[PDB]
Structure formats: C-alpha cells, structure tokens
Design a protein around this ligand. Structure first.
Ligand SMILES: O[C@@H]1[C@@H](O)[C@H](O[C@@H]2CO[C@@H](O)[C@H](O)[C@H]2O)OC[C@H]1O
Ligand SMILES: O[C@@H]1[C@@H](O)[C@H](O[C@@H]2CO[C@@H](O)[C@H](O)[C@H]2O)OC[C@H]1O
Lengths: 398, 398
C-alpha cells in the first residue's frame, strides 16, 4: 500500500479516479501495490503534512507546490531525488512541460511530478452583472477602480474575497508588487532577505490594498468569508459580487458547484496594467502546478514511481481537462479543444506560455518558518490592524 | 532500544561512558530502555546524519549544534519540541545554563539538550616554542603579526591549520569579521540576506586572510593538513607550529593525544584586538554547546528523556570536566577545580560568561543549503583561487 497524502478540495476527485484506475491496472499487479489517498482538508494542509511527515506513518508520496513547500523536507533528507528516475523512465522523461518539472526542482535536482493543472491567478467576473451595469473587463488599474465605484453604487460587492484563509488576500499583493516593481522585488525577499520587504514597491502595493479595502472594494466582513467552503466562489456565481481574483482552479470550482453559471456567465481576464509600473504585464503569479514528491523512507519506491507514471497518461490528462483544469503533460496541448470551455483553456495555456516570469504564491515560495508569520501580517493589513508602514516594519523583522 | 547518532571524534568517549552508565542504572530499567551510540565519523557527519534521518532506521536522538544544523529538521516536522518536557521535568528544568538551552532553541521553542562543553574558539600556543624565541601571546593584531615574523625567522610554522575540513579556515574569517565589523555583519547574513556578504568588514577580513597566507603565516602545505585526524593538533604539540586557532575542544584533544605537552607546554589566549575594528573585544565565536535533539518518530520518548536527564547529572558533568571540557550544567562551575587545568577551565568559563555576543560557527549557523557552498568559497579564498573580491561576489550569489 502506497499512501498518498493529498490536498482534499473538490479537485481531489481526479486523484481518486487515478488511484482507482491504477489499482485496477496491470502495472499495479506488476509491483504488487495499491495506492490509498489520504485526504487532508485544504484549510490546514501545510501543518497536517508537517505532523504526518514526522510521524511513524509518514505518507509515501505527498502533494506540494515546490519551492518553500518542499525546501525543508529536502534539506532534512526526507525526499527521493527524482532526477535520475525521471531521466531513465521514458514515460516520465517526456511526459511533462520541462518548465513545470523545473518548478518542482530545488538546487537543480527534480523532486516533483506534476499532478494537477497549471494555476495562474486570473481575474474572473460575472458577465450577467457586467452586462446589467454596462461594465467591461478592466484592462487597467484605473478602469478596475471605475468598475469598483459603479458596482458599489449598484449595491454589488465589487470583489468576492475569501478573507478567512488569508492567501486570497495575498493574491492582490502579489500582482500589485509584480506590476509595480517587477519580479526582482519578491525574488530578493524569497531568497531570504527580510530587508527586501522595505522595497518601495511593497509599500505602494500595501497602500493600494488599503485604499481598496477602505473604499469598499471587498465590502464589509470579507474577513469572515471562506474560499475553501465555497463561500467566495458562490458570491460571484450568484451575482452578489462582480469580480474575483483567484487561481485558475476557480473555473473548475465554478463548473462543479455552479455549472449553469460556469457555462454561460463566467468571464475571465488578466490582472490589469498599473500606470507607471515597471513589471512586464505578461507576468503571472500563482502555482506552476502541484507536485507529488516521494518520501525517502518509502518501502516500495518502484510502486510509487509506477503510480507517478499515470500522471503523464492520456487518462489522467483527460480527467484533469474534464474537471476544468489545463494539465502540464506534453499531450495536453493537443487536447484543449476537448475542454468544457476551449476558449478559456486556450487563453490560460497561452497566458502561462507567454509569461516572462511566473512567481510562485508567496506563502508557498518563502521559507516555511516565514509562511504563517507572513499571512498573519497580511491579515492585519486587510483588517486595518496594521498601517502599510506597520505591515512593512513587521515583515522586515522576520 | 534508543539509538543515538553522535559525532565520532575522540570526545565521543564521554558519550560511550554515558551509555555504559545509563544502561546499568535503575532509571534505565524503570523506563524500559537501553541506549546505543551510533558513532559517525566527524568528517562527513552532517551529510551522514541527513541520509540517516531520511532512512527507515533514523536515529531516536542525534547530535547537533543548534541553529542551521536543526532548522531544516525542525521545519520538516522531524523533532520533538522539548519546551514542555523540559519545563515539566525537575532535572532538565534546572539542569543547564539557561543561555545554553536558549542556543539549542528555534522560534522560542527548545529542541536541544546540552551534551558537550561550551566551545569558544581560542588562540592556543606552544609555550616551549614561545619561551625559546622570547615571544608572548599576542593581545593585538600588530603583536600577532610580529609573532608571525619571529616564528618564520625561527623556522616554525606560525599557525597550525587543518585546511582539509575548511571550517578551521573559517574560524579566522569569523573572528576577523566580528572584530572588524561587530556581530551585526554576520547577523545580517545568517538571517538570510546574501547581500550582507558585501559589508566592508567581509572584504577586509578576506584581505587579511590573503595577507596571512601570502606571507607564510600558515606555511605552504595547510590545504592538505587535517584537523580531524589529529594532524593540525600534532603540529602544535611537536613544536612544528607556534599557535593554533581552534574551538576549546583543542585542549581536550591535546590532553588525550599529547598529554605531556597539554600538561606543561600548552598556552591559551583570547583572539586579539584589531586596529581599526569596531567589534566588542570581549565577543566570542564558536559553538555554545552540542545538543541532543529527539526524533519526532521515536517510539520510546520516555526512554529517550530518561537518557537525556543523565546529561544534567554530576557523573556526566564530571566526565566532561575530566575530559578537559567545561560543561554547561548548572552543577559545573563550582566543580572546575577537578579540571586537568583549573586555570584554563576558569578562564574559559569566564570568557564565555562575559562575552556580549557568542556567534555560532557559520557553517552551522547559516541555512543548510548555504553551508557547503560557503565552505567551497572559503577554501578557494585560502588556496588563492579566488581573490577577496571574487570571494565576496561569489557569496553574494548564494
Ligand atoms: O497557500 C495557497 C494554496 O493553498 C493554494 O492552493 C491551491 C488551492 O486550490 C487547489 O485546487 C490547488 O490544487 C492548490 O494549488 O494556492 C494558493 C496558495 O497561496
Ligand atoms: O562544522 C564545524 C564543526 O564540525 C566543529 O564541531 C566541533 C568539532 O569538535 C568536536 O569535539 C565538537 O564537539 C564539535 O562541536 O565545530 C566547528 C564547526 O565550524
């Protein structure tokens, strides 16, 4: 039994389908192995995984985002270096976009096999709401503000926001810092320099966020709305909100929970430009993918590799596409017209392919011991407990 | 039953004696436990420990230096947080100097039990050589360079130096940066800002090292001379070198290897002051102690804790003292009269108690993913492959 610890949101249905398919397979018989999904709820996944990895019953494979989400496990000797496994296995070697495999590497060694869709953060919107108020998707920050003022007036919350998890608030900072100051601002911080939080682009992003909040862009009480229980996506699908800045898994989430809305009334656009900003507007922030990594303590390394091969298969790729995701397998590009929404799938594939920079979600990119302290300070910014200068000063002390 | 992975230099005799004592004690049968030392050679200890921690046979407790030597294991969920264990257990609670327990801590949580001596780096010297050439230990850098010239004139290598391991070279940089720029210089770097390598004090120290190498202060073969096999201590004991900059375990090393020399002819002094420097001249660098940490996977935590209480005992304290170490147990200071050299033991105790700052060895203090590449660059500086400027630029690139 290969245990696979996985992030248990609605998307886990794809991995459930894969465990079933693999378990019934001849490659499985061959390695005398079955996979068992250990589903861990989204809301406390990083802590639960850490506890499990220190336990006698640590998972044989586990779900991650690369970067800071594996750096400690790797430094602690807990991971199998997959570089040679991937190189010598024909299916693994040619199975994924090389850029996505690189995003699951550390120090030039590959530690992840891609296992969900590419996940850039996009601006989604309700096309009904817009049509009713003669709004158009904003190509600039000033137009985004115009849209906020009109929705406010019309009694519609401009943006849905899952304040509870705090990382949905972080998304605003991520795009703002990149648009304003380009990718080198966060690169410096991610590499460990806390002084880097002193960059003027960070302060400008933090002030811009405060203005949005103070001026009602997220309404009142977003700090009590959750993304993970479906609350924030439902605000959008019911036309209680006009827009929603979210990882591209939002489309899948909408399709499964509100299919009528997702089919007819869900729109999308890139995060807008910001006047005077130095960042290339083609840059994206989010998650290049999610990855399986393999525990160095595992007793059936070959069984686990066998299951990992399935991640490159036509059947796995089709299951992702049918879910609303755009997979990172080499065969996916040629299969996008099979998507529930081929225009969206194609918009999303090319947005990522054209991006000069793809910045990993900050709470997954920073060193693990910064992840929570950082989200704590972001929440204090959003609820107005910290001024933008206090926010900067707190982070400089990490 | 409890495996203990330990750094296997000559000092490991004290831990073998502890295992013998514990395994024969009533406390060990009470806790249903025995301990087995898994001795790992000094030269590749951090790598072998990392491989073992990722193995199905990971040790129940293991030797470390605190700081970066545990940061990854802690972040990876591999350690028991000892804070409450320590607080609840009378013997552990009052058994150690609180400053030493703090230096086994991360993020305010205690992960280490002290288990060797306090280990400031000191300048040792051969008193027979110094008497023959009418030298006195240097209190300033100018006196040190006068001593360098006179010892060269006498045909004696001025400093023994174990170039092979590289960290004995690092000691020179550590005290030179601290004396020149103060502890703030390395604090900046340790906390993860690689641009901190650009501080003028780093370049000045690197320049200073180069000058020492170029003028023959370490003679010509030092890159092939080992500390861990005894080669560097032997050069001092035999009077082939006049001085040796080393962690205070050098006293114990000498007493074990060259007892007549250690009894009669070994001198010690603090690292000298430095003209033009800004660092507090009392500051020290080295290891506050070594620690046991406990694997979060351990099946018999109570057996492990019973062995850890021995580290606070009078017997373990006396075994350290008799070895030539100065223990960090609360019972130790009034027992230093039992030391093979009470004068030195007291000197060392006071030097550490008076130091405004005690910087952890850099290769143990920095994040584990910087440790070997930093040592690689220190080596290139000492053997002349990198100029001071190239050394600074390479380290900036970490
Ligand atoms: O920390 C945050 C992650 O929790 C978030 O994770 C994504 C949530 O949706 C799942 O369907 C995706 O697989 C998963 O990657 O990404 C944002 C990050 O800030
Ligand atoms: O990385 C280096 C360590 O290997 C060195 O460790 C000391 C060696 O002597 C042993 O007797 C001590 O217990 C141990 O701490 O410390 C210096 C550091 O740079």
């Amino acid at each position: 039994t290969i245990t696979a610890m996985v992030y248990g949101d609605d998307a886990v249905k794809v991995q459930d389908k894969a465990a079933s398919r693999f378990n019934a397979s001849a490659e499985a018989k061959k390695a005398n192995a079955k996979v068992k999904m250990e589903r861990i709820p989204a809301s406390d996944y990083p802590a639960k995984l850490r506890t499990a990895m220190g336990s006698p019953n640590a998972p044989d494979i586990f779900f991650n985002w690369g970067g800071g989400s594996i750096k400690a496990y790797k430094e602690a000797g807990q991971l199998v270096d997959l570089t040679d496994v991937i190189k010598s296995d024909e299916v693994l070697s040619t199975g994924f976009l090389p850029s996505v495999v690189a995003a699951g590497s550390l120090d030039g060694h590959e530690y992840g096999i891609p296992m969900r869709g590419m996940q850039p953060v996009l601006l989604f919107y309700n096309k009904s709401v817009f049509a009713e108020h003669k709004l158009t998707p904003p190509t600039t920050w000033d137009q985004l503000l115009d849209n906020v003022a009109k929705l406010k007036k019309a009694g519609v919350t401009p943006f849905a926001l899952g304040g509870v998890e705090i990382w949905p608030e972080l998304m605003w900072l991520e795009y703002l810092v990149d648009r304003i100051g380009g990718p080198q601002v966060f690169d410096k911080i991610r590499n460990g320099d806390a002084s880097g939080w002193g960059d003027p682009a960070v302060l400008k992003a933090a002030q811009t966020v405060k203005q949005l909040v103070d001026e009602g862009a997220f309404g009142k009480g977003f700090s009590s709305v959750s993304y993970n229980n479906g609350g924030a996506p439902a605000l959008l699908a019911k036309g209680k909100a006009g827009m929603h800045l979210m990882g591209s898994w939002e489309y899948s989430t909408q399709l499964g929970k509100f299919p009528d809305f997702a089919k007819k009334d869900l729109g999308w656009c890139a995060f807008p430009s910001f006047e005077g900003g130095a960042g290339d507007i083609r840059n994206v922030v989010g998650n290049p993918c999610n990855y399986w990594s393999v525990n160095a303590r595992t007793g059936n390394k070959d069984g686990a590799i066998a299951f990992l091969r399935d991640c490159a298969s036509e059947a796995y790729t089709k299951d992702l596409i049918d879910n609303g995701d755009v997979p990172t397998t080499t065969i996916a590009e040629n299969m996008l017209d099979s998507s529930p929404n081929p225009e969206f799938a194609k918009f999303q594939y090319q947005l990522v392919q054209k991006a000069p920079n793809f910045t990993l979600s900050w709470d997954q990119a920073v060193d693990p011991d910064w992840q929570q302290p950082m989200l704590t300070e972001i929440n204090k910014l959003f609820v107005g407990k910290s001024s933008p200068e206090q926010f900067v000063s707190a982070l400089k002390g990490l």
